[PDB]
């Protein structure tokens, strides 16, 4: 039951969005601040490549380590 930081552009200051009590994040929780959003990715700090977040059935799941304080960048389609 944390907040994760989410942004639509890595330079922009992110906003915190609430997780579920189980540590997941609903896609709907994201799309209420980022309408259109279809997913998330984040900059892996060890490789500096982008890394996708798992989404199954409208539910986002944390990286194995947890969400931490990383900045999650929203994906949009097309």
Numbering used by the authors: 2 to 79
Copy text from the publication.
Crystallographic symmetry generated three intertwined superhelices of TDP-43 NTDs packed against each other, building a tubular superstructure. Within each superhelix, every turn is composed of 12 TDP-43 NTD monomers (two molecules per asymmetric unit) with a rise of 24.6 Å between two asymmetric units, a helical pitch of 147.6 Å and a radius of 34 Å to the center of mass, respectively. TDP-43 NTD adopts a compact fold comprised of a five-stranded β-sheet (β2-β1-β5-β3-β4) packing against one α-helix. In contrast, the tail (on the left, viewing from β-sheet with β1-strand going up) of the molecule is negatively charged and is comprised of residues from the β2- (Glu17) strand, the α1-helix (Gln34) and the β1-β2 (Glu14) and β2-α1 (Glu21) loops that interact with the adjacent molecule. In addition, at each interface, β2-strand of one monomer forms a parallel inter-molecular β-bridge with the β4-strand of the adjacent monomer in which the main chain atoms of Glu17 (β2-strand) forms H-bonds with the backbone of Met51 and Gly53 (β4-strand). This interaction is strengthened by the guanidinium groups of Arg55 and Arg52 that form salt bridges with the carboxyl groups of Glu21 and Glu17, respectively.
The RNA-binding protein (RBP) TDP-43 (Trans-activation response element (TAR) DNA-binding protein 43) is mislocalized and aggregated into neuronal cytoplasmic ubiquitinated inclusions in the vast majority of ALS, as well as approximately half of FTD cases.
